[PDB]
Amino acid sequence: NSNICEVCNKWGRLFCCDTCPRSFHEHCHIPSVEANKNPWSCIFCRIKTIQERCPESQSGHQESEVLMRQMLPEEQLKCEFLLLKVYCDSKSCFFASEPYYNREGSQGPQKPMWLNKVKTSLNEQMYTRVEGFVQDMRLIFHNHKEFYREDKFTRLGIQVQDIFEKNFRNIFAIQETS
Ligand SMILES: [Zn+2]
Ligand SMILES: [Zn+2]
Ligand SMILES: [Zn+2]
């Protein structure tokens, strides 16, 4: 097993996966690492098993169809993993916790949004369809672009959105296009 957390790359109190070498802090894993369960398989392993059970699930899909899917267990898992893939990037620190807005020449967004809120919303089964989760994720970066205007800090939103989008296309097997 690895000696650092797969998500935040720090050591500490780690839980080790039984079917791959990854390790996690308790609340870095999504869902939070489960109390008992021996053996325990991490989210990377669980996502791999889905693909292996249904190889055809990797054929291309239309985003419109993906977004309308109900949040049954497999889609819940895939959103959890996509969220985890965003937290894996260190630049997600900017978007994790509840923002506040007081900048000359800018007004705060009408609907603030942040990663820990999406995390809670997933944990509490508040999204009925994939679209709900994706909309809140995209709102995080859209709010940031709008607020920071021409400050070069806007680029952090572009960068972390790019990570989200690449992973969304990968996890949900979106049809590749030019
Ligand atoms: Zn961690
Ligand atoms: Zn694993
Ligand atoms: Zn099959």
Residues 173 and 152 in one domain: yes
Residues 97 and 64 in one domain: yes
Q: Is the CB of residue 114 less than 8 Å from the CB of residue 140?
A: yes
**Cα–Cα distance measured from residue 99 to residue 93, given in angstroms and rounded to the nearest whole number:** 11
Q: Is the CB of residue 85 less than 8 Å from the CB of residue 161?
A: no
Residues 22 and 65 in one domain: no
**Cα–Cα distance measured from residue 59 to residue 41, given in angstroms and rounded to the nearest whole number:** 25
How many Å lie between the centroid of ligand 3 and the Cα of residue 57?
Answer: 8
Residues 160 and 91 in one domain: yes
Q: What is the DSSP letter of 25?
A: E
Residues 35 and 94 in one domain: no
CATH of the domain at 39: 3.30.40.10
Residues 54 and 73 in one domain: no
- Please give the resolution of this entry in Å, rounded to 1 decimal: 1.7
Domain span holding position 162: 60-178
* Residue that is written with structure tokens 């959105």 in the block: 161
* Residue that is written with structure tokens 């679209």 in the block: 131
Token readout for 95 is 């978007």
Assign 69 to helix, strand or coil: coil
Per the entry, the structure determination technique was X-ray
Q: Is the CB of residue 50 less than 8 Å from the CB of residue 77?
A: yes
How many Å lie between the centroid of ligand 3 and the Cα of residue 40?
Answer: 24
**What is the number of domains present in the chain?**
2
**Cα–Cα distance measured from residue 160 to residue 151, given in angstroms and rounded to the nearest whole number:** 16
How many Å lie between the centroid of ligand 1 and the Cα of residue 102?
Answer: 31
Residue 87 makes CB contacts below 8 A (sequence gap 6+) with 7, 8, 28, 30, 96, 115
Q: Tell me the β-bridge partners of 23.
A: 16
CB neighbourhood size of 11 (10 A): 12
Give the β-pairing of 23-25 and 14-16.
Answer: antiparallel
Among 59, 91, 106, identify where a domain stops.
Answer: 59
- Nearest to residue 30, comparing CAs of 80, 82, 76? 80
Instruction: Provide, for the chain, the percentages of residues in helix, strand and coil under a 3-state DSSP scheme, each rounded to the nearest 5.
Output: 50, 5, 45
How many Å lie between the centroid of ligand 3 and the Cα of residue 103?
Answer: 53
Among 9, 32, 59, identify where a domain stops.
Answer: 59
| Element housing 14 (H / E) | strand 14-16
Residues 53 and 69 in one domain: no
CATH of the domain at 72: 1.20.920.10
